[PDB]
């Protein structure tokens, strides 16, 4: 749901969200992403699951 919202808010009012009580599978993130920038700092993007 977070990825195919049709009205991503502008930067000046950066809309927040909360992700809790769920199983984070980032394969869906990979699927819904012609990735251009996936620079991960505090964690390795390969090892997320």
């Amino acid at each position: 749901e977070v990825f195919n919202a049709t009205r991503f808010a502008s930067v000046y009012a950066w809309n927040r969200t909360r992700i809790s009580n769920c199983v984070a599978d980032y394969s869906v993130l990979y699927n819904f992403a012609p990735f251009f920038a996936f620079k991960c700092y505090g964690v390795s993007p390969t090892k997320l699951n």
Partner: protein
């Protein structure tokens, strides 16, 4: 003691970052722990 790194737990830093980026963190941990061990050994030698 984190010793100037992200985490103070070897198991979790290993399980969080990939080798070619976590090598810096583990090297920092190694330096700190080796320095502490050297201090301990020197103090033990003096007391002995």
């Amino acid at each position: 003691s984190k010793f100037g790194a992200i985490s103070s737990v070897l198991n979790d830093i290993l399980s969080r970052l990939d080798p070619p980026e976590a090598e810096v963190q583990i090297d920092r941990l190694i330096t700190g722990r080796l320095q502490s061990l050297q201090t301990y050994v020197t103090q033990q030698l003096i007391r002995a």
